[PDB]
Design goal:
It is found in: Secreted, Extracellular space. InterPro entries: Peptidase_S1_PA, Peptidase_S1_PA_chymotrypsin, Peptidase_S1A, Serine_Proteases_S1, Trypsin_dom, TRYPSIN_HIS, TRYPSIN_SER. It is an enzyme of class 3 (hydrolase). This protein is mostly beta strands and 223 residues long. It contains two helices and 13 strands. The protein has two domains: 5-7 and 103-211, Trypsin-like serine proteases (Thrombin, subunit H); 15-102 and 212-221, Trypsin-like serine proteases (Thrombin, subunit H, Beta Barrel), CATH 2.40.10.10. Strands 1-9-8-11-12-13-10 form a seven-stranded antiparallel beta sheet. A six-stranded antiparallel barrel has the order 2-3-4-7-6-5. It binds 4-methoxybenzenecarboximidamide and calcium ion. 4-methoxybenzenecarboximidamide binds at residues 171-174, 176-177, 191, 193-194, 197, 204.
């Protein structure tokens, strides 16, 4: 997260860290046994870390639970990042409390102008590299499809939306991948891609979760 703020410990209780020996992606807890992330975060040997603030220090609210199964969206295209969404089933259900809690799936797609909360442990610099140990937050609006398409000609599908600031300075970044965009207490987006980080006229692009709710619900019901 570039140009964000320190969320505060366990203020974003649905945020997960995907760990393969190190943090490599975020995710969202959507019920006690399932995490939603980006398909570009796929790998084998994932440990889901819930209840994190400082990902380098055991602070006492963590749950570390191995993945039993990963399901990449059947139509994920790694070239275009269309359908950049993946489900991860936990080996055992998380213990839900005020600091580890699921986020609701949307019943409706959020409109342009809606203010959302983006969070993650990704890079905090637009030039060079500085990875924070504590969770960062950014409030950002959803941009119009026309501003999103104008920023990324020929690259925005109906399964993507832009959020952030055309002026730059404030964006998600590498390491925020797979993390949540929460609007009005519902998961509306997944950190997917962008051209650099926090660049002028190059907002963040997010998987449009509201297009995937039937796939998510049907998948969870049968797995
Ligand atoms: C490789 O991951 C990302 C994720 C987000 C962004 C961005 N929001 N600019 C860029 C690269
Ligand atoms: Ca920790």
């Amino acid at each position: 997260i570039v140009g964000g703020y320190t969320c505060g410990a366990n203020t974003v209780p649905y945020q997960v860290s995907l760990n393969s020996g190190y943090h490599f992606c975020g995710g969202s807890l959507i019920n006690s046994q399932w995490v939603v992330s980006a398909a570009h975060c796929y790998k084998s040997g994932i440990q889901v870390r819930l209840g994190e603030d400082n990902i380098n220090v055991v602070e006492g609210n963590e749950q570390f639970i191995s993945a039993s199964k990963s399901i990449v969206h059947p139509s994920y295209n790694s070239n275009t990042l269309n359908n950049d969404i993946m489900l991860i089933k936990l080996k055992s259900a998380a213990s839900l409390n005020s600091r580890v809690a699921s986020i609701s799936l949307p019943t409706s797609c959020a409109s342009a102008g809606t203010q959302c909360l983006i969070s993650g442990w990704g890079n905090t610099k637009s030039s060079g590299t500085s990875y924070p140990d504590v969770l960062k937050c950014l409030k950002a609006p959803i941009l119009s499809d026309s501003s999103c398409k104008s920023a990324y000609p020929g690259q925005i599908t109906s399964n993507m939306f832009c959020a952030g600031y055309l002026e730059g300075g404030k964006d998600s970044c590498q390491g925020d991948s797979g993390g949540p965009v929460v609007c009005s207490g519902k998961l509306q987006g997944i950190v997917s891609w962008g051209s650099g980080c926090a660049q002028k006229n190059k907002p963040g692009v997010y998987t449009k979760v509201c297009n995937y709710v039937s796939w998510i619900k049907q998948t969870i019901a049968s797995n």
